Symmetry: D2
């Protein structure tokens, strides 16, 4: 029932990315990013309970995924400092957002699943 959930996959090992730092920001009135939520992916590669529907108000959100630390913890030098997704949430009604990221050392793919 979480409005926002983040799923991270490893394309080199073919397993969920475990213990990946995820930071969520909201755009402020002065075009600044303020901290909104944080967490780390579980052993299933997904992060639940980031925020409730009461907090998850309409705005422009930034989901920052700390891919650099994850690849460094595996002894791999990556290219991107981080993989982050900027999107507008709850523009027309509350929706449940899933941010799926597929990670490689020098490339990444991200897709969104938006439902009601």
């Amino acid at each position: 029932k979480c409005p926002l959930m983040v799923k991270v996959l490893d394309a080199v090992r073919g397993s969920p990315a475990i213990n990946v730092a995820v930071h969520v920001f909201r755009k402020a009135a002065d075009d600044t990013w303020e901290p909104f939520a944080s967490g780390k992916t579980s052993e299933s590669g997904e992060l639940h309970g980031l925020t409730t529907e009461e907090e998850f108000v309409e705005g422009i959100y930034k989901v920052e995924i700390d891919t650099k630390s994850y690849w460094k913890a595996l002894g791999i030098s990556p290219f991107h400092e981080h993989a982050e997704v900027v999107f507008t949430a709850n523009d027309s009604g509350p929706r449940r957002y899933t941010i799926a990221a597929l990670l490689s050392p020098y490339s990444y793919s991200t897709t969104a699943v938006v439902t009601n």
Copy 2:
């Protein structure tokens, strides 16, 4: 289930529903004999394709019939279908998740293998 298929649509930001999936096994004469079939559910998943008893070791081909998916939406695609060919259960029983992300002129596939 030891073999699961998940399909996602990168154009509409939703799971791909009612997508035909056909599983083949390479025979002794390099021939693909039918093994399992189904269609993705409302969540874009295909459950209960096989059981570990009959999911013997061998080369398996998972054909995701993408062209029929796009024609039912009014889009003329490029690929005739998306096919994933892999060796399964070579070094002991495993659980396989085939994930595909579909675009009219592109697609990406990934696999998650977990030791039970």
Copy 3:
């Protein structure tokens, strides 16, 4: 001016994939694939001069990228036996086809660029 090009990229080293075997098969009237063209990607991970425009006719073509040999040479055990792309070519006129593939050990993505001469 070749109407069929194959470009292959590596998503792990962030470099073009070099010396990747690429086999092109054409579908016959009895639902089997018969060889049409073959070659290996160059130092820039590209494959030009596969055939000629007149020889490249309407039909269903299969491009197999032998990714498993690429990963085994690199010392990585992959998941996919190969990356095969099957498409209908020249359905409504002579087009130029570029097949681009991005490779990871357990995943890959492919795309196509189609232009009208």
Copy 4:
């Protein structure tokens, strides 16, 4: 040719993305982004002359690909506000960097092709 190049592709129509705004930033000493370069994609979806070797110095760069405006011009409402790539460049000597982005309305994949001249 140029130390920085951007390639943008469109996976919905299978053609290069034409006239796509690309912005390049450089991180300042106070952890702020200062403008570095900008341009629009050519007929082949490429950016050239965006910078040369001596301007393109070691640092943390942000390549912002304005995908939202591209999809609106096509009558498509996208998901991401932009495609946004942060990386460190020339940390061990000058390199040629090619950013390649494949765009879909609700997804995008980006890859880098780093070469040593």
